[PDB]
Amino acid sequence: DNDPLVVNTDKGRIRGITVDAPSGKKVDVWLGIPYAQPPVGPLRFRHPRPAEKWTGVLNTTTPPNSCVQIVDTVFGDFPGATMWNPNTPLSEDCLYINVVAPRPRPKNAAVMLWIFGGGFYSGTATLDVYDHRALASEENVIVVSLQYRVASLGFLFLGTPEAPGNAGLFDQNLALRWVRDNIHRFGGDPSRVTLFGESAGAVSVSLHLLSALSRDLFQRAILQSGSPTAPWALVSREEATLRALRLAEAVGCPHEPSKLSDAVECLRGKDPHVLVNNEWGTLGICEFPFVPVVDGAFLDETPQRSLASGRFKKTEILTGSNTEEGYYFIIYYLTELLRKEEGVTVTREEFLQAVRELNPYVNGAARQAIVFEYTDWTEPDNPNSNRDALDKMVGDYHFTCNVNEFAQRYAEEGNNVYMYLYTHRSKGNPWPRWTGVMHGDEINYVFGEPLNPTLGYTEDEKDFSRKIMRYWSNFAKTGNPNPNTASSEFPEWPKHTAHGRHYLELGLNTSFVGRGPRLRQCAFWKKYLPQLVAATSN
Amino acid sequence: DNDPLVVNTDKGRIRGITVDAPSGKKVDVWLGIPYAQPPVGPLRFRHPRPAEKWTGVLNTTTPPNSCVQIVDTVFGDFPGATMWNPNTPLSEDCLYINVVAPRPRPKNAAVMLWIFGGGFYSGTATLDVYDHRALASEENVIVVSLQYRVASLGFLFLGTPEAPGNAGLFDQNLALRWVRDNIHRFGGDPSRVTLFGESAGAVSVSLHLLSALSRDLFQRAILQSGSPTAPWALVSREEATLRALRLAEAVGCPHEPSKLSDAVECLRGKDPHVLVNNEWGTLGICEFPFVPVVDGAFLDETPQRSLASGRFKKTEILTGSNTEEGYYFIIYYLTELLRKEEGVTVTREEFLQAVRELNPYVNGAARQAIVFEYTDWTEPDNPNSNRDALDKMVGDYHFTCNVNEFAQRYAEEGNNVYMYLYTHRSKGNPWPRWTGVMHGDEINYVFGEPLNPTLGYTEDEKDFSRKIMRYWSNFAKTGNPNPNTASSEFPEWPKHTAHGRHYLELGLNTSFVGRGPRLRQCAFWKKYLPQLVAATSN
Ligand SMILES: *[C@@H]1O[C@H](CO)[C@@H](O[C@@H]2O[C@H](CO)[C@@H](O)[C@H](O)[C@H]2NC(C)=O)[C@H](O)[C@H]1NC(C)=O
Ligand SMILES: *[C@@H]1O[C@H](CO)[C@@H](O[C@@H]2O[C@H](CO)[C@@H](O)[C@H](O)[C@H]2NC(C)=O)[C@H](O)[C@H]1NC(C)=O
Ligand SMILES: *[C@@H]1O[C@H](CO)[C@@H](O)[C@H](O)[C@H]1NC(C)=O
Ligand SMILES: *[C@@H]1O[C@H](CO)[C@@H](O)[C@H](O)[C@H]1NC(C)=O
Ligand SMILES: [Co+2]
Ligand SMILES: [Co+2]
């Protein structure tokens, strides 16, 4: 065909469509490309099979079905909560890819590949926050995104072939293989694939750097507020086996570790919606029932041992955190304290009880170390500072410091690292003004949501999106976010070197280069408190 | 006599002398006024008796004998060390008072009463650094000072009547009773006696607020680098007996706790220089062999209990610290490392060894907390930063944090407190460059030593001296260092209130107002580490 919209993929022909960006610059899109067999019936829980080849021309004009997942209804139809809720029908047949190329169609352009986040229980590529048209057109890159299986449906583990674990990661892996085989046909370069993700998506990106099966499938990596050394990122084979049995028990299935065939058989027979709804039992803050696991094929060691020994992809990294990571998770957890309303505060007594609840696995002498490290000693009983203390202890432990470990371990092995601290509140932010720069706020600006003027983003926010979109794309192209010839509009992002630990603050009216971020609080979590538990355990 | 230089005291007459203050201005001085029977022979170690009345007119014109103590000759003749050594001849007959009045002679002026410091083992009022002429003449106040017994001669305890303890403080108490009975005859107000001291002199001054015996002998208090809850300020009455028995053992006297009369008798017979030069056995950093004790008369409870209950004088307080309180004591103690020379530094392993030797009583799980709290996580193995960390751990624990606690409890019992942080180096400081603003560095400036034209102080340093001399004298006069009308050259010193905890930075080119200072580091020593040791120690 002389038509550019039709593209001969390795398994068949697909017809795309030309779509207007919100900027007014046209782009070619291909939405809902089948990259794998629908994991249905006996294929549930297992690793994906490549899609059966088709005869004729399939129209890839519609956003695909999202994977079966729970829906966030705790705050009803609250725009800040519902923006992450899935916007396409929930189906087990969710294994699809979306490609968006700029106009005119490039030759061998840099490929930016988005892997979504939702604590490995939720999320989808089809959300409007992940719109590719801005990032593609404004920066001249092939923006790609994929669906992977989430929750128990993508991460059930029993230490058996029929529930081998990491099925969601192998979904991502098979998509990376697809991009390598086919993205050149859409105007991309297979050798310049940059993986970028947020939260569990950023964790996923880090596991792809560590893993052997995906070591030769991409080039560079961006990691927004996530890393493979996070407490929640992985779970042990011993605990993962028990939770699958708990799921079977809760759903009404045979749930004995002696005979594990009977459990999976009926689990595959159950409705996928009742399966996901009965996952959440008694779990603490920021720990998710079904997440990645050290299986043997994808990963054959814990990410710490890979990181300690130095066994990871020798490539550039761009990573970072936000100032208020914890609040989002302490909103959904701790519901009675921290209500979704304006001007909430925490009294010292309420703060003292929260460290017990937010850290239920630590002795008591360790809990004394936590109350000292996270206290505003200028005004110890300040209701606003005590609320802030809760955000930081959760945010540092579960996100910021784990990004720092990963980034610092990449630095002192020779690779160039570029750390950010995202410090900006959107002017019309639906959440309370005390919540600050929450986990996932950066996403709105990296994907060019302010360039859509039908949303009421300011002029400086539009300039700020254009600013960080360049850093992201510049890095994906050449391995440096910095421009070729420096500018006042585009300040210097220095390397996060091992000896220096520098980072660039990302905000409206700044270019402040700090060091860390928050090295003392991370030193607490990663060095001090571990040996304090080791000392006081006996 | 209508001659003004003579004054008929309660025990006789004395004649003073007119002399020039270094500046050029003229003052009346009365040097070596006896206030006690020489504590000689039977009266050694016991509390002082008042002076026997004399006939005629005593020529009170020569500076008094310094009390028996050791001479600092580890560095030989280093000007920075020899300035604290005694400049008048050593004698047991040392219980004298100095009075210096400005001209024209006032009528009912504020009395600024100086108590010196030397770890309760050393010091004298006659030192050229404590030059009263400049202060008196510049601020129009009656500057008074006194000689109190130091070392074992001043503070020996065996729990007997013949060695009751606190003789040095009872010397000060009697000296305060003299100033109350007599200072109206020199032109001073007995009701406006403001005590002021540094190091152990500030401790002394602080205990006078606590004490029942000296409660009604003065008005206000100024406290430089000192506090009654300092670890070195007092020792236990249990320990202090053992200290005396070890001193008796060293000199060759009976050291049997069953028979204490033979010990004190034998000790009374020995030469006073033998006694002082055999006190320093195996004592760690910032802990002195003979210091104050809870006796029953001067103090009938520990300073911590009196602060717990609010049992102290209801008045104003002007207290503070310097930035580098520790180095001075880390130079003399621990001399193999950190020696007296330019550009010295401490490596990580030397820091790790230093924390063991500067805190040898803690259990090791506590050492991990100290190293964590006093390491620069920006650059953990920086030799400069590891050195400064040693200054702080000693400077905080022994000085800064006890000053803060005393100011805090005062502030939150409704008293008007004023906190400072002295941050200024003399331009011609003989000590090394790395030492910074060391312990007792402010004394030269509060006493008006920069106004001496034979010395080479800068004109900015002369202004800075006149600046703080005004604050001090304003406080002594009114209970507030800030001037009435609020001058532009004199910045606002806000009250160190219980809620805010504001302190003024005292430097050349700064009027910076902070919080604390070092509240986080003081919460470590006073809040966290105490409950750690109790958690860990079995
Ligand atoms: C989309 O697929 C459908 C069916 O698989 C096709 O839709 C038709 O194609 C042409 C497009 O100009 C028109 O006749 C109608 O829109 C549809 N007619 C019929 C008979 O199906 C088509 O192959 C694909 N879309 C396009 C734009 O080619
Ligand atoms: C210091 O004391 C002396 C002796 O009590 C005072 O009297 C002087 O005594 C000497 C004898 O050594 C006579 O030569 C002088 O004439 C006396 N001096 C005066 C001024 O009368 C002496 O007055 C006292 N010192 C001062 C400065 O008055
Ligand atoms: C913010 O920008 C303004 C000029 O637009 C300028 O004052 C400065 O760069 C920033 N403001 C500060 C640092 O107060
Ligand atoms: C204090 O420092 C500032 C720096 O901005 C300078 O302008 C000023 O001249 C300094 N003060 C004096 C008295 O020199
Ligand atoms: Co059962
Ligand atoms: Co013996």
- DSSP assignment string, B221-250: EEEES--TT-TTT---HHHHHHHHHHHHHH
Give the DSSP letter of residue A118.
Answer: S
User: In Å, how far are B101, B375, B384 from A100, measured between CA atoms?
Assistant: 90, 50, 54
Cα(A487)–Cα(A493) distance, integer angstroms: 11
At B321, give phi and psi (nearest 5°).
Answer: -145, 170
Residues paired with residue A163 on neighbouring β-strands, in sequence order: A160
Residues paired with residue A99 on neighbouring β-strands, in sequence order: A30, A144
Are B116 and B88 contacting, i.e. CB atoms less than 8 angstroms apart? Answer: no
Question: Which residue has tokens 């603050």?
Answer: A505
Amino acid (one-letter) located at B26? K
User: In Å, how far are A482, B215, B311 from B306, measured between CA atoms?
Assistant: 62, 14, 5
Query: Torsion angle of alpha carbons A58, A62, A68, A70, nearest 10°?
Result: 180
Are B129 and B117 contacting, i.e. CB atoms less than 8 angstroms apart? Answer: no
Are A211 and A467 contacting, i.e. CB atoms less than 8 angstroms apart? Answer: no
Q: Which residue of A has its CA nearest to B532?
A: A365
Cα(B396)–Cα(B398) distance, integer angstroms: 6
Cα(B396)–Cα(B404) distance, integer angstroms: 10
Residues paired with residue A438 on neighbouring β-strands, in sequence order: A324
- Kindly give the distance from the C-alpha atom of residue B152 to the centroid of ligand 6, in angstroms, as a whole number: 20
Q: Which residues make Cβ contacts (< 8 Å) with residue B25, sequence separation at least 6?
A: B102, B103, B137, B138
Q: Which residues make Cβ contacts (< 8 Å) with residue B410, sequence separation at least 6?
A: B312, B317, B417
Cα(A538)–Cα(B52) distance, integer angstroms: 68
Beta strand pairing call for B513-515 and B502-506: antiparallel
Q: B480 lies in which domain range?
A: 1-538
Nearest to B34 by CA among B13, B18, B5, B19: B13
Cα(B34)–Cα(B454) distance, integer angstroms: 32
Number of domains making up chain B: 1
Q: Which residue of A has its CA nearest to B364?
A: A535
Cα(A396)–Cα(A393) distance, integer angstroms: 5
Angle at A221 between CA A219 and CA A226, to 5 degrees: 155
Nearest to A141 by CA among A469, A492, A440: A469
Cα(A176)–Cα(A187) distance, integer angstroms: 16
Look up residue A370 and give its two tokens. 């936590």
Q: Do A532 and B365 touch (CB under 8 A)?
A: yes
3 state DSSP class of B51: coil
Residues of B with catalytic function: 199, 325, 439
Contacts 24+ apart (CB under 8 A), A531-535: A531/B368, A532/A365, A532/A366, A532/A369, A532/B365, A532/B368, A532/B369, A533/A362, A533/A363, A533/A366, A535/B365, A535/B368, A535/B536
Helical pair A237-251 and A261-269, crossing angle rounded to 10 deg:
50
Atom of ligand 2 nearest to the CA of B61: 27
Give the DSSP letter of residue A524.
Answer: I
Cα(B264)–Cα(B167) distance, integer angstroms: 14
**B365 close contact with A: CB closer than 8 A:** yes
Q: Is the peptide bond before A104 cis (omega within 30 degrees of 0)?
A: yes
CATH code for the domain in which residue B36 is found? 3.40.50.1820
Nearest to B138 by CA among B425, B444, B467: B467
Are A147 and A125 contacting, i.e. CB atoms less than 8 angstroms apart? Answer: yes
Give the resolution to one decimal, in Å: 3.0
Angle at A409 between CA A408 and CA A414, to 5 degrees: 95
Which protein residues are within 6 Å of ligand 2, measured from CB?
B 15, 59
Cα(A241)–Cα(A225) distance, integer angstroms: 28
Q: Which residues make Cβ contacts (< 8 Å) with residue B304, sequence separation at least 6?
A: B229
The H or E element spanning position B466 is: helix B459-478
Q: Is the peptide bond before A517 cis (omega within 30 degrees of 0)?
A: yes
Nearest to B224 by CA among B355, B114, B124: B114
3 state DSSP class of B279: coil
Ligand 1 near A61 CB (within 6 A): no
- DSSP assignment string, B29-53: EEEEEE-S----GGGSSSPPPPPPP
Look up residue B184 and give its two tokens. 């109206």
3 state DSSP class of A271: coil
Residues paired with residue A422 on neighbouring β-strands, in sequence order: A322, A506
Residues paired with residue B146 on neighbouring β-strands, in sequence order: B97
Ligand 1 near A13 CB (within 6 A): no
Cα(B91)–Cα(B68) distance, integer angstroms: 6
3 state DSSP class of B80: helix
Cα radius of gyration (chain A): 23
- Kindly give the distance from the C-alpha atom of residue A67 to the centroid of ligand 1, in angstroms, as a whole number: 28
Nearest to A286 by CA among A401, A115, A156: A401
Cα(A397)–Cα(A230) distance, integer angstroms: 8
